[PDB]
Amino acid sequence: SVLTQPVSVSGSPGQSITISCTGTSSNADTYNLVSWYQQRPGKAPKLMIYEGTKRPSGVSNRFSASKSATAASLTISGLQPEDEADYYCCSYATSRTLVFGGGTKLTVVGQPKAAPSVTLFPPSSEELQANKATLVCLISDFYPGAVTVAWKADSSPVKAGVETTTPSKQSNNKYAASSYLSLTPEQWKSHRSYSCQVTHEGSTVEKTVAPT
């Protein structure tokens, strides 16, 4: 048995979404035994449904499930930002082995479009003594996930020694990402100021550092 789920589902707060789990080389017992797991960003999976439709105690009544002889489905009613997670279905591959579906990424849309709290740090005195320099640009609390990071020297854009992270979600349902600029101590002293221009939803947040 092979279990297939939609790659992604979108929903707005207060709305209802249904995630399907369909099988190949599967039967009615496959769906009778489906269990559903919620995996929030950076968290361990949590059992939401077992035996196709049974909800464990502690799991919110906003989660319900249905099953037929051809598929199993999970329904989330009254969508909340905390529901943003990856959902996996699971059942038997054979009489003795289990298999998970590929997973469904649920996005909760329309949250407050907040600007990022950009904080740029210059290379430490300890790092420069070891003949190395790393500029740390921290991009925290922002919605949507889409960003652009631009490094500058005085006003000039830098593209070499640039390492930008893909935005990862926090507990407060807001995105977070970091950017690192590696230079030599002599390269750092060559410029008057160093800029970190972060373009989010059209607005650009600029934080600057100087060697002197």
Binding site: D29, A44, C90, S95, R96
Partner: peptide, 26 residues
């Protein structure tokens, strides 16, 4: 979940009712 049905945890019955309810951090 299996503990609720078979409290011995021995019997390897085909396609038995299960639920992975406790996970480590990995």
């Amino acid at each position: 979940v299996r503990f609720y049905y078979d409290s011995t945890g021995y019997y390897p019955d085909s396609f038995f009712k299960y639920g992975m309810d406790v996970w480590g951090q990995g």
